[PDB]
């Protein structure tokens, strides 16, 4: 996912945001953390691996 | 119903002419979005008439 979203800059932004909100990029990052925004801290470790 | 003698293919259309148009072909065209990136089908099947 990392090559891929340095490719996709040379013609569309929609690229850019089908994949980090959208798709699988979002998704990713919740394994090791779920809900770990709800502060500047990592808080409310609902899923922890 | 007269038998003429013609010597190439140009002394043909000259008298008779050429080949019937065809009736049946179909074009047909589809745009798509694949991940954010367009893509355009042309299609032409062969003719069953």
Known sequence: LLIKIKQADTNTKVENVLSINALNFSAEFEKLLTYDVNTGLTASVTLDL | ?49
């Open chain 2, 1 to 49: 119903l007269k038998p003429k003698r013609i010597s190439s293919l140009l002394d043909f259309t000259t008298y008779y002419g050429g080949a019937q148009n065809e009736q049946g072909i179909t074009v047909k065209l589809t745009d798509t979005l694949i991940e954010g990136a367009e893509n355009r089908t042309i299609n032409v099947p062969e003719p069953t008439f």
